[PDB]
Ligand binder design. Structure first.
Ligand SMILES: *[C@H](C)[C@H]1/C(=C/c2[nH]c(/C=C3N=C(/C=C4\NC(=O)C(CC)=C4C)C(C)=C\3CCC(=O)O)c(CCC(=O)O)c2C)NC(=O)[C@@H]1C
Ligand SMILES: *[C@H](C)[C@H]1/C(=C/c2[nH]c(/C=C3N=C(/C=C4\NC(=O)C(CC)=C4C)C(C)=C\3CCC(=O)O)c(CCC(=O)O)c2C)NC(=O)[C@@H]1C
Ligand SMILES: *[C@H](C)[C@H]1/C(=C/c2[nH]c(/C=C3N=C(/C=C4\NC(=O)C(CC)=C4C)C(C)=C\3CCC(=O)O)c(CCC(=O)O)c2C)NC(=O)[C@@H]1C
Ligand SMILES: *[C@H](C)[C@H]1/C(=C/c2[nH]c(/C=C3N=C(/C=C4\NC(=O)C(CC)=C4C)C(C)=C\3CCC(=O)O)c(CCC(=O)O)c2C)NC(=O)[C@@H]1C
Ligand SMILES: *[C@H](C)[C@H]1/C(=C/c2[nH]c(/C=C3N=C(/C=C4\NC(=O)C(CC)=C4C)C(C)=C\3CCC(=O)O)c(CCC(=O)O)c2C)NC(=O)[C@@H]1C
Ligand SMILES: *[C@H](C)[C@H]1/C(=C/c2[nH]c(/C=C3N=C(/C=C4\NC(=O)C(CC)=C4C)C(C)=C\3CCC(=O)O)c(CCC(=O)O)c2C)NC(=O)[C@@H]1C
Ligand SMILES: *[C@H](C)[C@H]1/C(=C/c2[nH]c(/C=C3N=C(/C=C4\NC(=O)C(CC)=C4C)C(C)=C\3CCC(=O)O)c(CCC(=O)O)c2C)NC(=O)[C@@H]1C
Ligand SMILES: *[C@H](C)[C@H]1/C(=C/c2[nH]c(/C=C3N=C(/C=C4\NC(=O)C(CC)=C4C)C(C)=C\3CCC(=O)O)c(CCC(=O)O)c2C)NC(=O)[C@@H]1C
Ligand SMILES: *[C@H](C)[C@H]1/C(=C/c2[nH]c(/C=C3N=C(/C=C4\NC(=O)C(CC)=C4C)C(C)=C\3CCC(=O)O)c(CCC(=O)O)c2C)NC(=O)[C@@H]1C
Lengths: 169, 160, 36, 161, 641, 161, 160, 161
């Protein structure tokens, strides 16, 4: 796992360089965003269960076939597994928000994810849509609350969305 | 998009983007507000655009909704309107990107094979895109009507 | 004795229905109900 | 390849969605950056050869790499190496214009490590040359455009790691 | 995007348990024929089948009435049946208008679904489907559905269903028992998820819903205890051998370590110590250490001792260090003494393959663990976990877009591809439609058409292959000793060596094409087209191969280079789909790049190599240059001389 | 694995015949070379660390691979390369003692090339380091046993290519 | 052979051969003329050993070649003698190798399963090897006879 | 590929050196051997088919290899095998003329072992056939050129085992 500081250090060590002005500026940006990142993670912790439940409900309202026969959320077994997967995505998105780096998603969520869903027949597209639903809910929550910085919030979710979804163009 | 198409053209020739290509990208990026407005107008009227275009389609080709036609019954007609919705959405994609590549990659490469497999008369889909084009041009000014009509005609010409 | 034949017996074709537009087309279905 | 606009288009398409407010916001941000990107691309294109020349003089010339036994020894190898630097500069300019590194993943870093290892090309020396290109390009195109071009050249460098 | 793939094989978790599956899996997991126990279960179940199908028939026929009775008891103020898709103290009927159409639809659907899955469970002879899909449904629907109302509806359905079975206490008891299970399971609170915590900081923690575990096939667990009967101890030891050695080598070959077995069955050593000493034994050494490089041996050892494959780059790194330092004993000791081993198996339990259904699975080693758990794992020699884990962290490899198996050897003649099943070595990587493969020019580097697209056709001189051209005039364009016979024939034989790799045997050459070329009637391009389309080429190079292997070899022979990526591959493959072999040949030889590189008078030749091919040629001891990949010290006579 | 004795026995067994004169000659040749093989193996075992040390100093130190961005940069990677050379020397000694390269295929080469490709380890540099090992060992062990060791070190090199 | 045994043992411990193992290899290499001589004796008298041993065996255990026996018939008796010849050949392999590993790997791993499937009584095969041992020892000096009898009795003990 | 002259030149050029006394001595020795090499190569070109014929008759015919079930069985496989022997003889003659084995590694032995393993071609039988070629060539061309041809045929054998 690599966070923003580790990513920067790796970049500079690759060339055997001491940290210069640009490195110090990037580290300063991360450190000043740290409070907002911590607040966003705490807000997610305060609402994770309801976020997951509401996002799943919205997804099954948008794609009702999922909870109907032959849908991959059909039956309580598959429904529970789906809510479990949504919980996974939210927890690792919170990790990525704190780290200001999406490598945690790459290492522990995305690598081999397409293979697993293909093996099980889990449909990728609805999962990506559910990720986006949770992202929108988090963004609205952050806007409602007394949080100053909320632009970083989208970064992990979008990353997962780009990494897992099929390439159309 | 315009950017990726210009890059691909330049790279095929192993050269930097030409001054003319750079000028075209600059003009596109400066005019972005108009294209975003056009996309918003097409998106907002999507239901009425699809509905009126489908009405005109089933008037010009009643056969597809007559028994023995591909779009016979509420289900098949509904799926036809859904397909019209896809092609309108791709039209918006092509408008905002300033290039036909999104439309082509999403809904033209191998479209003949798909609708041949489904027993769908591809000419009727081209005519439906014509109907949507007319309805859309009836909801916007002449300049932006032409701006959208370029991509509408692209879809029609590729499906015929 | 011949009753043992299940996989070697005459196959019993099962009914599998052609899939049809699901609820995700509901809006268009309404549009189809208002296009006649 | 996939630029900012195309990345937005893909995100919307895979959900069967029309572009919403956030997508239009991303498009508008890319449009705002477009002028700077075009200016930097024009300047670099005009000065690619001299950028490479100065980078080579900074990092490669008068070292064991160009002496007999070094990987830049002989005219064919020297020409190949400055050709590679031309490649990296041009494709970094492409990525900067697109605002996306995907072109680098697709036709720059794919199998590059195997290529250089099979050829015997030294990885550390080319990384230092690309760093020199980043520095020269920054000194030519100013701090902000140098930061962006450096993002993409450093992407190439991290690929070679 | 992701830079590597561990492979993806079809996964078939068990949705629910049935009596035949239960019995047959009970026999099959123990590597034996069905015995009197399982066969008797099968006999009793098959005998009951007629009655069970009668129950199912009567319930499906009258499902409408049963669901209607439930809906009428549960709902008040309207007709619930307008749209169809003992009493708890808190029960109160629900108003149709207030409750809403969507929720009414879900109520009716759920009642019918309960009855349907009850009939399914009756037929299957096991309530496992009901338990699986009903334990924890309450908490799923508490907040939009009345639990008392659902209970009353299920009680009404139970009574109505059993009302059709005054026959005797055979049909009625089964229906009542399955409905009672449904009732008690709907009343059940949600059980906690099974947590699989990360054994270290490089492995993530996971959890699995208990319903998922309940559906999947249960892993039989063997534990050695002092009080077990002798037959049970025998079964446990056989399970230990099946786990460690992947099959019962005692049954197959009478291979066994008797003193270890006596010690473990006496309790002198625990099952953990027995596993440690068995995995250190010369039997295990010969079977799963000697045949493998250490990198693959440690992956197999993880299978055998922990029941799982490596989980991360750090883990394979650590354990490869351990085996490099202390070999097989160190590896076995580290695995067996790990906190993870004791956490799962302790001292008494024989290790078992965990995998899907037994606990929450990770995505990162999904395909690799699927492969590892197969009984064919010993015949993969190439490491799969270190390779895939390393490739995650690096850009796309130098590899055909459809996989490593689609890359033939870059030799003079022969289409040699790795066979997918023979010594499995597959290395899938996600190349999207737009990637371009980096190729090494056979010639001046700066003439590579990527950087110098107008260099196409520039002959490579001494740095590249020999190029055969019909530059001289053709004979008879009478007299003997006309010198134009040697050049044209040399070119004809060169064309044969190019299209087929080597010269043909006598009687195989397309003589008509040769005379028609020697008479100026066709061009060199036309002649090589005839050669490529010849039935001999079809039989040799098209017919015996995967379609895309045939296309790739064809491209290398005709265009003198591998394909760049999915664009060329897809177009030729699509032509193969639509038209066939002759049309593919036509497309390759009529392409623009052929014309640019080769005119109407140039025999094609090798223009490019993959990195792998060049390394094959130029990395051998006798061909490796002295300055490549090493420091060249200038030798100077000592100053004291 | 097979040694020379087991190799001749198995070549006789696959045809189901007793050991004839030629097979006995092969066995006699191996028994005659066994003393030299054992002495060379003792010498190599005594100086294994020194052999790898001197080969690395001869081939890889003060070059691209050890500088930032080179595959031997960082202490972990340096140590890994050293112990890969240790592997190759130990297994070459095994093969020389056995008079057969079967062990090399079984416990060195099968899947090593793919592993190195996945890790990005340079193969040509590895071959040059192994050749340095061959030269150092030959200077330590003698010309003939040095040639025998060179056979198996070159076997490893060819397997890597 | 001791060379492979020691190499495998050292390899499992990721170490070079110890000086004791190398000295053992040295002694084994030096003492090879006697082994090759015993093997040459055995292979020279192959058919005689097999025929005499088979005669003695069938005299001693007529039920093997009487009705109902596994070796009853012209082809069955020939096959039984073929097996005797197999095991003599393996014994010579063991003598030359100075080790029982070639014998074990070629003709003792799973031998019980094979002969159980074929219906052959394994103890009678052990008796056959005993007869071959006696015949072979009759044609050799005492020291050589004992050295060969070591491998013969290894086979006998593993087959019964 | 490199011949003896080109090998000398490459070592010098990699040092950046002019050709000193030792390099000129190597060149002189190769020039001295040139006439013998040319005579031997002419003889082999004259008798190539006979050399292959006699080597096959000595090593492969009237054995399980040619009988049904062997790899040389069927006229197609027979032709392929004798073609391969012709290839090996031609490339050994090339190497002898050049005084360098490099052409064997770049053109013959690259991927050859993998080829024969994927085809099921028996390697020991091929090696025996090549050694029979060596003996026939020695008896035909002499004991000095025979020794050089033996060096290069044994090089081919070394890359196959
Ligand atoms: C309430 C009086 C009635 C009712 C209504 C109801 N159900 C849901 C939601 C779900 N119901 C299920 C049902 C099942 N899962 C299975 O596997 C089976 C077979 C054992 C059944 C019957 C599931 C999976 C859901 C969740 C997904 C979905 O919405 O379909 C709701 C909505 C809950 C919400 O919070 O939105 C309602 C209102 N169910 C009853 O049993 C009563 C008769
Ligand atoms: C919900 C939005 C979607 C859905 C989900 C669904 N998933 C499964 C099964 C699994 N999901 C995973 C995923 C992960 N495991 C991990 O460790 C991580 C990384 C942090 C992820 C994302 C796995 C591995 C499985 C299988 C193993 C397991 O259950 O733990 C199911 C069940 C599939 C089945 O029927 O067997 C479901 C239903 N389903 C939908 O319809 C949504 C699109
Ligand atoms: C002298 C007649 C002309 C001249 C020469 C000049 N050259 C350089 C710098 C370099 N020259 C080379 C050339 C070669 N390297 C090789 O390996 C080969 C063949 C083996 C050749 C011909 C190289 C590589 C360099 C780069 C420096 C380095 O060696 O590392 C200079 C210096 C230029 C500068 O700005 O440093 C000069 C002056 N210049 C003239 O005007 C003459 C016509
Ligand atoms: C220069 C900083 C370093 C260097 C370079 C060098 N490269 C080569 C040869 C090649 N370079 C490439 C690279 C690419 N081809 C592509 O298509 C792309 C993607 C856009 C890249 C990066 C290739 C493929 C080759 C092989 C020949 C060819 O161009 O087709 C050489 C020559 C090697 C030789 O032995 O001839 C050299 C010298 N060498 C250094 O020492 C510098 C650090
Ligand atoms: C025979 C003369 C007498 C006899 C023997 C007998 N022993 C057992 C059980 C065991 N024997 C041992 C002994 C050892 N195991 C070892 O590994 C070694 C060290 C090399 C020794 C000495 C052990 C450990 C057991 C228990 C486990 C096992 O059965 O292997 C039995 C069976 C007892 C039972 O109740 O099943 C018997 C019959 N019994 C007599 O009556 C003879 C006087
Ligand atoms: C100075 C306090 C001591 C000392 C130093 C010394 N080091 C070397 C040679 C090397 N040192 C390194 C070190 C590193 N490489 C890495 O990747 C890392 C992590 C960043 C480290 C620390 C290496 C790799 C070498 C090899 C040379 C090369 O870089 O190519 C020497 C030279 C030894 C020789 O004989 O050549 C010396 C002198 N020596 C002392 O006595 C001090 C205690
Ligand atoms: C040294 C001359 C060169 C070099 C080596 C190098 N290797 C690695 C890493 C690994 N090497 C192996 C090797 C083997 N696996 C086997 O089973 C066997 C057969 C006995 C061998 C030899 C493995 C498995 C690894 C990976 C270890 C790990 O998991 O970390 C490295 C480090 C790579 C990294 O990314 O850490 C290096 C440096 N590198 C050079 O440049 C030299 C030419
Ligand atoms: C008889 C009509 C003519 C004749 C025959 C002849 N042949 C040989 C030797 C060989 N013949 C073959 C042939 C085949 N092998 C195959 O696999 C196939 C198809 C299945 C064929 C037809 C082979 C391989 C040999 C070599 C010996 C061997 O089998 O190993 C000879 C002997 C040649 C010699 O010098 O030994 C002869 C005499 N000869 C005539 O004159 C007749 C016209
Ligand atoms: C002859 C002594 C042994 C033998 C040979 C044999 N080889 C093949 C098939 C092939 N041989 C090659 C070899 C090469 N291709 C190259 O590029 C090079 C360097 C120029 C070599 C040496 C190849 C590639 C093949 C396959 C393709 C082809 O045969 O054209 C066969 C036939 C196998 C088959 O049925 O395909 C045979 C019989 N076989 C023996 O038994 C001898 C020991």
């Amino acid at each position: 796992m690599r966070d923003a500081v580790t990513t920067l250090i790796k970049n500079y060590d690759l060339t055997g360089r001491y940290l210069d002005r640009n490195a110090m500026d990037e580290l300063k940006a991360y450190f000043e965003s740290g409070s907002a990142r911590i607040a966003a993670a705490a807000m997610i912790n305060a609402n994770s269960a309801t976020i997951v439940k509401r996002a799943a409900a919205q997804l099954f309202e948008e794609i009702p076939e999922l909870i109907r026969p032959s849908g991959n959320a059909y039956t309580t077994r598959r429904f529970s597994a789906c809510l479990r997967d949504m919980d996974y995505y939210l927890r690792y998105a919170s990790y990525a928000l704190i780290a200001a780096d999406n490598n945690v998603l790459d290492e522990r969520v995305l690598q081999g994810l397409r293979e697993t869903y293909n093996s099980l027949g889990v449909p990728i597209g609805p999962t990506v849509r559910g990720i986006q639903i949770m992202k929108e809910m988090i963004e609205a929550m952050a806007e409602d609350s007394s949080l100053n910085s909320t632009d970083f919030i989208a970064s992990p979710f979008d990353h997962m969305t780009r990494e897992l979804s099929e390439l159309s163009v | 998009s315009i950017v990726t198409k210009s890059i691909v053209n330049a790279d095929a020739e192993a050269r930097y983007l030409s001054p003319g290509e750079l000028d075209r990208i600059k003009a596109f990026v400066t005019g972005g507000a108009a294209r975003l407005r056009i996309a918003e107008t097409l998106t907002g009227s999507r239901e009425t655009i699809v509905k009126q275009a489908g009405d005109r389609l089933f008037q010009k080709r009643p056969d597809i909704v007559s028994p023995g036609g591909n779009a016979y019954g509420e289900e098949m007609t509904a799926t036809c309107l859904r397909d019209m919705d896809y092609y309108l959405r791709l039209v918006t994609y092509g408008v905002v990107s300033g290039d036909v590549t999104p439309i082509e990659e999403i809904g033209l490469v191998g479209v003949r094979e798909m609708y041949r497999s489904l027993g769908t008369p591809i000419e009727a889909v081209a005519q439906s895109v014509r109907e949507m084009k007319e309805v859309a041009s009836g909801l916007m000014s002449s300049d932006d009507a032409a701006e959208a009509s370029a991509y509408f005609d692209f879809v029609i010409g590729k499906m015929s | 004795p011949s009753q043992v034949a299940f996989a070697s017996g005459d196959p019993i074709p099962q009914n599998v229905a052609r899939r049809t537009p699901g609820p995700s087309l509901n809006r268009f279905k309404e549009m189809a109900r208002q296009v006649k | 390849m996939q630029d900012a606009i195309t990345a937005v288009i893909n995100s919307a398409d895979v959900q069967g969605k029309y572009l919403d407010g956030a997508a239009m916001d991303k498009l508008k941000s890319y449009f705002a950056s477009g002028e700077l990107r075009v200016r930097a691309a024009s300047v670099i294109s005009a000065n690619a050869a001299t950028i490479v020349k100065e980078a080579v003089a900074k990092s490669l010339l008068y070292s064991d790499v160009t002496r007999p036994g070094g990987n830049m020894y002989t005219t064919r190898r020297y020409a190949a190496c400055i050709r590679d630097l031309d490649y990296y500069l041009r494709y970094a300019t492409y990525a900067m214009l697109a605002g996306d590194a995907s072109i680098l993943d697709e036709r720059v870093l794919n199998g590059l490590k195997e290529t250089y290892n099979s050829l015997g090309v030294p990885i550390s020396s080319t990384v230092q040359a690309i760093q020199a290109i980043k520095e020269v390009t920054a000194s030519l195109v100013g701090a902000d455009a140098g930061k962006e071009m450096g993002v993409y050249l450093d992407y190439i460098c991290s690929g070679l790691s | 995007s992701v830079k590597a793939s561990g492979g993806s094989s079809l996964a078939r978790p068990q949705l629910y348990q049935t009596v035949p599956v239960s019995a047959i899996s009970q026999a099959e997991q123990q590597d034996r024929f069905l015995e009197g126990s399982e066969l008797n279960e099968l006999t009793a179940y098959f005998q009951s089948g007629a009655l069970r199908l009668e129950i199912a028939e009567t319930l499906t026929q009258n499902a409408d009435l049963i669901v209607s009775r439930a809906a009428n008891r549960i709902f008040t103020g309207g007709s619930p049946l307008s749209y169809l898709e003992p009493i708890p103290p808190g029960f109160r009927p629900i108003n149709i208008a207030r409750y809403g159409p969507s929720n009414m639809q879900k109520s009716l659907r759920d009642m019918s679904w309960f009855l349907r899955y009850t009939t399914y469970a009756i037929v299957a002879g096991d309530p496992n489907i009901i338990v699986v899909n009903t334990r924890g449904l309450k908490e799923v629907i508490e907040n939009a559905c009345s639990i008392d109302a659902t209970i009353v509806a299920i009680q009404e359905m139970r009574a109505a269903s059993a009302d059709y079975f005054r026959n005797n206490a055979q049909a009625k008891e089964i229906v009542l028992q399955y409905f009672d299970i449904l009732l008690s399971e709907f009343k059940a609170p949600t059980p906690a998820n099974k947590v699989r915590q990360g054994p270290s900081n490089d492995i993530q923690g996971l959890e699995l819903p208990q319903s998922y575990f309940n559906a999947a096939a249960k892993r039989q667990k063997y534990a050695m205890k002092p009080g077990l009967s002798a037959l049970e101890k025998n079964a446990v030891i056989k399970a230990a051998y099946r786990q460690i050695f992947e099959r019962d080598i005692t049954k197959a070959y009478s291979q066994s370590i008797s003193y270890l077995e006596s010690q473990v069955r006496n309790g002198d050593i625990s099952m953990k110590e027995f596993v440690r000493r068995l995995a250190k034994s010369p039997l295990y050494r010969k079977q799963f250490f000697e045949p493998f490089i250490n990198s693959r041996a440690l992956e197999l050892a993880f299978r055998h001792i922990l029941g799982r494959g490596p989980s991360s780059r750090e883990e394979v790194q650590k354990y490869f260090s351990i085996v490099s330092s202390g070999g097989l004993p160190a590896l076995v000791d580290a695995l067996v003494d790990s906190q993870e081993y004791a956490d799962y198996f302790g001292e008494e339990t024989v290790p078992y393959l965990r995998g899907l259904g037994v606990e929450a699975q990770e995505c990162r080693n999904w395909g690799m663990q699927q492969d590892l758990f197969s009984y064919s794992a010993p015949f993969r020699k190439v490491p799969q976990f270190i390779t895939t884990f390393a490739q995650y962290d690096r850009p796309l490899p130098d590899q055909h877009v459809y996989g490593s198996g689609n890359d033939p050897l870059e030799i003079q003649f022969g289409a040699i591809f790795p066979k997918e099943t023979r010594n499995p070595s597959k290395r899938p990587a996600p190349f999207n439609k737009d990637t371009k493969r980096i190729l090494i020019h056979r010639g001046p580097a700066v003439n590579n058409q990527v950087g110098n697209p107008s260099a196409v056709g520039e002959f490579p001189g001494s740095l590249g292959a020999k190029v055969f051209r019909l530059n001289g005039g053709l004979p008879g364009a009478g007299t003997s000793v006309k010198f134009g016979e040697s050049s044209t024939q040399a070119l004809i034989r060169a064309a044969y060596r190019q299209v087929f790799g080597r010269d043909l045997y006598e009687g195989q050459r397309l003589s008509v094409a040769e005379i028609q070329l020697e008479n100026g009637d066709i061009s060199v391009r036309e002649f090589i087209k005839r050669l490529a389309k010849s039935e001999l080429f079809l039989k040799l190079y098209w017919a015996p191969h995967y379609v895309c292997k045939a296309i790739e070899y064809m491209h290398r022979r005709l265009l003198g280079r591998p394909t760049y990526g999915r664009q060329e591959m897809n177009q030729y493959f699509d032509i193969a789909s639509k038209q066939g072999f002759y049309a593919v040949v036509e497309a390759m030889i009529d392409s623009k790049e052929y014309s640019d590189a080769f005119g109407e008078d140039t025999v094609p030749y090798e223009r490019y190599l993959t990195p792998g091919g060049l390394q094959m040629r130029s990395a051998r001891v006798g061909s490796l240059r002295e300055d490549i990949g090493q420091r060249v010290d200038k030798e100077v006579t000592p100053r004291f001389v």
